[PDB]
Write a structure and sequence with these properties.
This is part of a larger assembly, with chains A (318 residues) and B (71 residues). Chain A contains 11 helices and no strands. With 318 residues, chain A is mainly α. Chain B has 71 residues and is an all-alpha fold. Chain B is built from 2 helices and no strands. In chain B, 1% of the residues are buried. The chains are: A mainly alpha (318), B mainly alpha (71). The complex binds 1,2-diacyl-SN-glycero-3-phosphocholine. It is classed as membrane protein.
Chain lengths: 318, 71
């Protein structure tokens, strides 16, 4: 009865710690890329930087908005936050080390992504000015296009292995990582995850909003974005790179707790996010949506067809 | 107002008076490079394509054997 709230707290709080240190490590590693050090004064190694920024944003004198000042403005950031976390519900960190074995996990993740789209659009429109509304529409369209691409990719990885709950998928990978044969599929899925949260090369919506509001509201919004980032990284490494499985299967690796492997893979993908951020200019909006509807949809569909074909001719399909 | 200021020591005439020590050493320091040069030595076309296709086929065979075991 009381164990469940304990598990939920133990899932929520460490995620917030990790996402604060995520934005910290983001600044640090982009700095190191650009031939400079990051924040290195406050902490012993800059470790006390996110805590200091949080305390500053707390003591900062707030400013309540003047646009539907209740039940529509002080709710939508909480909506996107709740959506990101409830997505974080069903993710396997080890054998049985999950919160809920929802036997249709993949559909669940896809639905939650769409609901995040709802979160961002209502948070955009809840404001007063209209340019924020146009930006919200742009972000919604981008997010939903790359969601349909993500959907087709999920269908591929699902064809490769019968069931849907993620533990079964990671066993299927326990034979051999699906990232190996479907490497282009992994690349496409990663680009779609990049476009899904607007991070590295696709930023013109946010860039324009910065080119043309509550402190805690903006903090909650950025928190939701980066949490969704960690989630996308996590499911990418949970269904295309192995998910707590040692490499080369030698009984010296089997001393590592398994959970460590999942953390190593997700930290590698986070580092790849931050790395591909600081190497490339940004697309426009036209070219962005054009690539979404011309380059990734047909490729993903063709890949579904091809993998189904290759796995239906030989008795290789469980 | 220049003779001894510039150099007093031992010259007989105003010529060959000073020692300057201003510019470069004899030789121009080097011939330097200015043209771009970016070598292209990565596996060009067929290497990478065969790598992709072969690893895909072999990964599918491995997926087959693994699903056999799991069944
Ligand atoms: C039997 C099957 C055998 C398969 C053999 C291999 C075939 C692979 C074909 C699919 C490749 C998938 C990966 C490339 C891809 O999706 O390119 C799409 C497209 C390629 O098309 P394009 O849009 O770049 O083309 C140039 C532009 N036009 C269309 C005007 C000519 O890739 C991109 O657009 C790149 C977007 C930016 C990505 C930045 C992040 C990079 C992250 C790290 C990557 C490493």
């Amino acid at each position: 009865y009381i164990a469940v709230p304990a598990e939920i707290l133990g899932i929520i709080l460490p995620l917030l710690l990790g996402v604060a240190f995520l934005v910290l490590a983001e600044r640090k590693v982009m700095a190191f890329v650009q031939r400079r050090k990051g924040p290195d004064v406050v902490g012993s190694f800059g470790l006390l930087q996110p805590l200091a920024d949080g305390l500053k944003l707390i003591l900062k004198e707030p400013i309540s908005p003047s646009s539907a000042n209740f039940s529509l403005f002080r709710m939508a950031p909480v909506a996107t936050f709740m959506l990101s976390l409830v997505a974080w519900a069903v993710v396997p960190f080890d054998y049985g080390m999950v919160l809920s074995d929802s036997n249709i996990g993949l559909l669940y993740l896809f639905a939650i992504s769409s609901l995040g789209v709802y979160g961002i659009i209502t948070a955009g429109w809840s404001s007063n000015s209209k340019y924020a509304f146009l930006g919200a529409l742009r972000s919604a369209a981008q997010m939903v296009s790359y969601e349909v691409s993500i959907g087709l990719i999920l269908i591929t990885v699902l064809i490769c292995v019968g069931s849907c709950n993620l533990s079964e998928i990671v066993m299927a990978q326990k034979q051999i990582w699906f990232g190996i044969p479907l490497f282009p599929v992994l690349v496409m899925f990663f680009i779609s995850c990049l476009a899904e949260t607007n991070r590295a090369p696709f930023d013109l919506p946010e860039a324009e909003a910065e080119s043309v509001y509550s402190s805690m509201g903006s903090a909650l919004f950025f928190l939701g974005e980066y949490a969704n980032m960690i989630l996308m990284s996590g499911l990418c490494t949970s269904l295309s790179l192995g998910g707590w499985l040692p490499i080369l299967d030698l009984p010296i690796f089997k001393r590592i707790p398994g959970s460590i492997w999942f953390s190593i893979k997700v930290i590698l993908f986070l580092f790849l996010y931050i790395w591909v951020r600081a190497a490339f200019p940004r697309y426009r909006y036209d070219q962005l949506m054009g690539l979404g509807w011309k380059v990734f949809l047909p490729l993903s569909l063709a890949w579904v067809v091809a993998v189904s074909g290759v796995s239906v001719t030989f008795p290789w399909l469980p | 107002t220049e003779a001894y200021i510039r150099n007093k020591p031992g010259m007989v005439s105003v010529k060959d008076m000073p020692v300057l020590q201003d510019g470069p050493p004899p030789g121009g320091f080097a011939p330097v490079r200015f043209a771009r040069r970016i070598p292209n030595k990565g596996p060009s076309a067929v290497a990478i394509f065969l790598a992709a296709f072969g690893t895909f086929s072999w990964g599918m065979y491995q997926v087959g054997q693994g699903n056999k075991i799991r069944r």
